[PDB]
């Protein structure tokens with residue numbers, strides 16, 4: 662894949678590994694690492710006409726930022742879980 666796609670894949674794997682161990686501080690760090698990588702990747706795909714599965718992920722990503730900033734902690738938890746799963750499945754299409 663692209664180098665950026667591999668960076669995202671690796672970072673998703675790390676988030677899953679941290680989640681498995683219950684290391685919530687490391688999950689937070691790794692989600693923050695994912696943030697700029699996904700943002701850049703997504704806009705690259707948009708510059709070449711777009712992917713509906715990518716668009717779906719990004720829609721959820723925006724909703725997550727809106728929920729988190731508003732303190733809507735239940736909506737953040739649900740949306741993060743579902744969107745990170747959509748991204749794992751997307752990048753498993755390799």
Ligand SMILES: C[C@@H](c1ccccc1)P(=O)(O)Oc1ccc2c(CS(=O)(=O)O)cc(=O)oc2c1
Nearest residue numbers: 689692693695696699721722725726729741744
């Ligand atoms: C889950 C990630 C994602 C990444 C790509 C797609 C879908 C979800 P994300 O939403 O981008 O990851 C974050 C970002 C920021 C924070 C903050 C800091 S602030 O902006 O809230 O001040 C704090 C925090 O606890 O977690 C974050 C997670």
Ligand SMILES: [Zn+2]
Nearest residue numbers: 696697722726
């Ligand atoms: Zn983000």
